Design a protein around this ligand. Structure first.
Ligand SMILES: CCN1c2cc([N+](=O)[O-])ccc2N(C)C(=O)c2cccnc21
Lengths: 543, 420
């Protein structure tokens, strides 16, 4: 049924004109059908016939919908959709189950073909014109146009949403103890009323929309809890993680592995422990997407251990606003953190994990800091507030690092939690030269073009060394110079270099890096008891 | 209660802003919901549909000495896209020199004035909902928006008139309007300055708008010299440190030389080894201290070029900055110590810092600097608004501090005792 709602004014993108595409030829059956179907909505006032003063056209198709050996229709609005203006935002981002509060009951109403309930701006209707031909392409084709928002058209979702919002405003005002959330063509209503009462209000609302032409579905098929809402199995009092089925199989294709690793990765958010390191290996060197790969037994043992993790199902709890939010984090490995946000211990609202590709140069604390921050942003998106943090790092350690680090950084109110393993400062360069320690003056150079270099050092104690490198580069050389001094030095060492990169390290004091070389240097820095590193400008006298 | 409206337009070719709303806390979505239902009533804003695709971020803040939430919109994008423009707002050169200046919030004035019907769309904004459980509440401005650049433009006239009598009756005072504010400076002692300011409000209040230690003190903002250390005896290490500093510094002052000191540095000696200064080193040094006793000659501000502010965290609560237009030709530079109470957080300290520096830029050249911040975007975006308290918002980019530019400025001079 059409409705008495103000139409939303709609225009084509800057300087474009309506669609003008030809209509495919059709079987006696696919034409017969569409003629029946259109005469239908035609009588419903949903679509109206148009003459030749309309030069536009969109391709109508006919496909017998599954589980109905009866004929249905489909209009191809691709082109019109290209030429239509943009709207603000149909689907901001998805609400997360952990952000809902429990309700005694939740009911869903199918405001189904309600797109055909809302009317289309009269002016725009012309662009929606379409044709039903005839058998032998006689003379005319039977032409029509939508007087109502068409299923498939770019604007339908947005307009349909704003419309429904107006329409629910009065009911919403009178019943603030009730909750409505529209998503697509489903009205999800929930509340804490005694069930009879709740039943009553829905009927009320059902009559309200009904005043607006928006008819609701037969008893023969209404939906009931749990609700499958993209990934979760939602109950009014608790949510549950819907089944993740790993096909146990005989022979495995590259592609299959990709999809497999895809799913397993989505999974790890809720089930950390899931792993894919060996399963990823089966990819190296793959020549085709359909080439079969032999499952290394390291891969069997892993594929196995994951079917087990995905056995134990998981249930979470909804949000209670009268309680504090707690976010706890753990470092699973280098650059790997896991977290769980909960209100009542062991009663988790949400969990997740992060892998941090070392990149240029970082340190564990900096990395913790980014975890907190990523967590902090998602908490604000979910519960409009940020968690109290329980963190695996001492207050002493954090104070030392941050007060001195070169970049501005911060961590919201938090508290140390002694859950091993704690994140700590792997090493710290001394601030002034060490007394009673050897001093290596290191230097390294390479011919940019030939990639031929030398690296070495001489010390205040008489020692010296030098090495020749093939296929090297300048930075490598300078670094290598530093590596050697570290290797041959002993527990305490002073080292002078004119390397630019040394300035980076002195500043950042990274504990991870992309460079296997910087990494070697770092392992070395860690082993020492005391290291003072110093930079002097290049090519001046100093040496 | 409208008037005839001045048509505003987007610079040619441009299209409206379509900036995304940053997530907000419960606390502030509530505050804005209230703030907006009210203004909607008063006819200042109006709900809109989906047919409007533009958007600009919003948020709420509270001024120190304010415990009543204030709505602040981010119009930087709109402003960049808004045509420039008889009263056009000129910057004097007098408050740079005043003994004191006072900033006044006259943002309220604009809401009286209607804004052209066809430019309203471009002012669309959104109050988002928690966990996206609801769609956003979209509004748009019917009157002149606060923090928009067209706003003090259009209200120029009304403003000149409103003021003239305080003006002509006190030409010993300066008044500067930079967007939602009015800087009011005088050399008159505090007694007369404070009292004369209050009078000025009353002068304003009288025409309608409420217009609200704290006092500023221009050109007490002197640039400091770089002082070089002094020891009884120098070590290999002190010299190396000192030499690396000077070598870089010579990009600013080309008369700084490092050869006689570098000489003492030939020879693989132990860093803790003490070295006495050759009389040739001693002079070269004394000669550098001199070149350093004053700012580089030749740096002149150029109205048609962007102003740039760079900050370096120095640790222990300290920060150093430099305003310039051309690298190494600084117009001003300085040191900032953390505000009492910001003892556990950098983002707090840094936004305070940014605010003070922007203010001075305004006073001096009436222009906001583009900032270069020693912070990761994510860290800044997540928490900057929490502590922001100014009607305007300057431009910024996130960077990585070269270690050298940091060692240099740490060297700036400080009061022998302080201010007492
Ligand atoms: C209150 C309705 N509802 C619910 C809310 C919601 N939102 O706010 O975005 C999204 C989905 C949703 N669904 C489908 C529910 O089943 C539900 C379950 C428990 C509480 N509120 C639930």
């Amino acid at each position: 049924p059409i409705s008495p709602i103000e139409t939303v004014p709609v225009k084509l993108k800057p300087g474009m004109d309506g669609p003008k595409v030809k209509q495919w030829p059709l079987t006696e059956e696919k034409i017969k059908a569409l003629v029946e179907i259109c005469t239908e909505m035609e009588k419903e006032g949903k679509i109206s016939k148009i003459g030749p003063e309309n030069p536009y056209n969109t391709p109508v198709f006919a496909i017998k919908k599954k589980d109905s050996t009866k004929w249905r229709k489909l209009v191809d609005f691709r082109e019109l959709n290209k030429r239509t203006q943009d709207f603000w935002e149909v689907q901001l981002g998805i609400p997360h189950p952990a952000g809902l509060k429990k309700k005694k009951s939740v009911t869903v109403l199918d405001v189904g073909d309600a797109y055909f309930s809302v009317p289309l701006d009269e002016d725009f209707r012309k662009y929606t014109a379409f044709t039903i031909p005839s058998i032998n392409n006689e003379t005319p084709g039977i032409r029509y146009q939508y007087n109502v928002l068409p299923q498939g058209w770019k604007g339908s979702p947005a307009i349909f949403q704003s419309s429904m919002t107006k329409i629910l405003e009065p009911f919403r005002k009178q019943n603030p103890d009730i909750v409505i959330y529209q998503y697509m063509d489903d009205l999800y209503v929930g509340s804490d009323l005694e069930i009879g009462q709740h039943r009553t209000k829905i009927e009320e609302l059902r009559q309200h929309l009904l005043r607006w032409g928006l008819t609701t579905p037969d008893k023969k098929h209404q939906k009931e809890p749990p609700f499958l809402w993209m990934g979760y199995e939602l109950h009014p009092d608790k949510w549950t993680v819907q089944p993740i089925v790993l096909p146990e199989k005989d022979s495995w294709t590259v592609n299959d592995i990709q999809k497999l690793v895809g799913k397993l990765n989505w999974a790890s958010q809720i089930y950390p422990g899931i792993k894919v390191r060996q399963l990823c290996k089966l990819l190296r060197g793959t020549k085709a997407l359909t080439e079969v790969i032999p499952l290394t037994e390291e891969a069997e043992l892993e594929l196995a251990e994951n079917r087990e993790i995905l056995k134990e199902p998981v249930h979470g709890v909804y949000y209670d606003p009268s309680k504090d939010l707690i976010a706890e984090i753990q470092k699973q490995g280098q650059g790997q953190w896991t977290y769980q946000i909960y209100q009542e211990p062991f009663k988790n609202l949400k969990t997740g994990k992060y892998a941090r590709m070392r990149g240029a140069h970082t340190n564990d604390v900096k990395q913790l800091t980014e975890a907190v921050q990523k967590i902090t942003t998602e908490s604000i998106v979910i519960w409009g507030k940020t968690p109290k943090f329980k963190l695996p790092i001492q207050k002493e350690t954090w104070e030392t690092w941050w007060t001195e680090y070169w970049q501005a950084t911060w961590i919201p109110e938090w508290e140390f939690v002694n859950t091993p393993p704690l994140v700590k400062l792997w090493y710290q360069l001394e601030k002034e030269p060490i007394v009673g320690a050897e001093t290596f003056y290191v230097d390294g150079a390479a011919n940019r073009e030939t990639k031929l270099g030398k690296a070495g050092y001489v010390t205040n104690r008489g020692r010296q060394k030098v090495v020749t490198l093939t296929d090297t580069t300048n930075q490598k050389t300078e670094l290598q110079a530093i590596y050697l001094a570290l290797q041959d030095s002993g527990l305490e060492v002073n080292i002078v270099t004119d390397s630019q990169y040394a300035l980076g390290i002195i500043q950042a004091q990274p504990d991870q890096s992309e460079s296997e070389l910087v990494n070697q240097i770092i392992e070395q820095l860690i082993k020492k008891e005391k290291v003072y590193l110093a930079w002097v400008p290049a090519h001046k006298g100093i040496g | 209660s409208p008037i005839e409206t001045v048509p505003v337009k987007l610079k040619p070719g441009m299209d409206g802003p379509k900036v995304k709303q940053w997530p907000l806390t419960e606390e502030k979505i509530k505050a804005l919901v209230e703030i907006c239902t009210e203004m909607e009533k008063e006819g200042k804003i109006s709900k809109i549909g989906p047919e409007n695709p533009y958007n600009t971020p919003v948020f709420a803040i509270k001024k120190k000495d304010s415990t009543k939430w204030r709505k602040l919109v981010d119009f930087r994008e709109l402003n960049k896209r808004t045509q420039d423009f008889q009263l056009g707002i000129p910057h004097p050169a007098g408050l740079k020199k005043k003994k004191s200046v006072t900033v006044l919030d006259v943002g309220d004035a604009y809401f009286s004035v209607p804004l052209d019907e066809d430019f309203r769309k471009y002012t669309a904004f959104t109050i988002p909902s928690i966990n996206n459980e609801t769609p956003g509440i979209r509004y748009q401005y019917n009157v002149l928006p606060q923090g928009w650049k067209g706003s003090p433009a259009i209200f120029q006239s009304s403003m000149t008139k409103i003021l003239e009598p305080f003006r002509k009756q006190n030409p010993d005072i300066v008044i500067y309007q930079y967007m939602d504010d009015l800087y009011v400076g005088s050399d008159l002692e505090i007694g007369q300055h404070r009292t004369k300011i209050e009078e000025l409000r009353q002068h304003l209040l009288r025409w309608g708008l409420t217009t609200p230690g704290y006092e500023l003190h221009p050109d007490k903002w002197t640039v400091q010299p770089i002082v070089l250390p002094e020891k009884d005896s120098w070590t290999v290490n002190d010299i190396q440190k000192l030499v690396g500093k000077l070598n870089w510094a010579s990009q600013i002052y080309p008369g700084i030389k490092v050869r006689q000191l570098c000489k003492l540095l030939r020879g693989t000696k132990a860093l803790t080894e003490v070295i006495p200064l050759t009389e040739e080193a001693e002079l070269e040094l004394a000669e550098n201290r001199e070149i350093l006793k004053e700012p580089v000659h030749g740096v002149y501000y150029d109205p048609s070029k962007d102003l740039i502010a760079e900050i370096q965290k120095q640790g222990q609560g300290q920060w150093t900055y430099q305003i310039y237009q051309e690298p190494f030709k600084n117009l001003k530079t300085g040191k900032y110590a953390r505000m009492r109470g910001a003892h556990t957080n950098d983002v707090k300290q840094l936004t305070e810092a940014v605010q003070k520096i922007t203010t001075e830029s305004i006073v001096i050249w009436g222009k906001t600097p583009k900032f270069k911040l020693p912070i990761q975007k994510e860290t800044w975006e997540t928490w900057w608004t929490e502590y922001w308290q100014a009607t305007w918002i300057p431009e910024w980019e996130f960077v990585n501090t070269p270690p050298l530019v940091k060692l240099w400025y740490q060297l700036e001079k400080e009061p022998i005792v302080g201010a007492e």
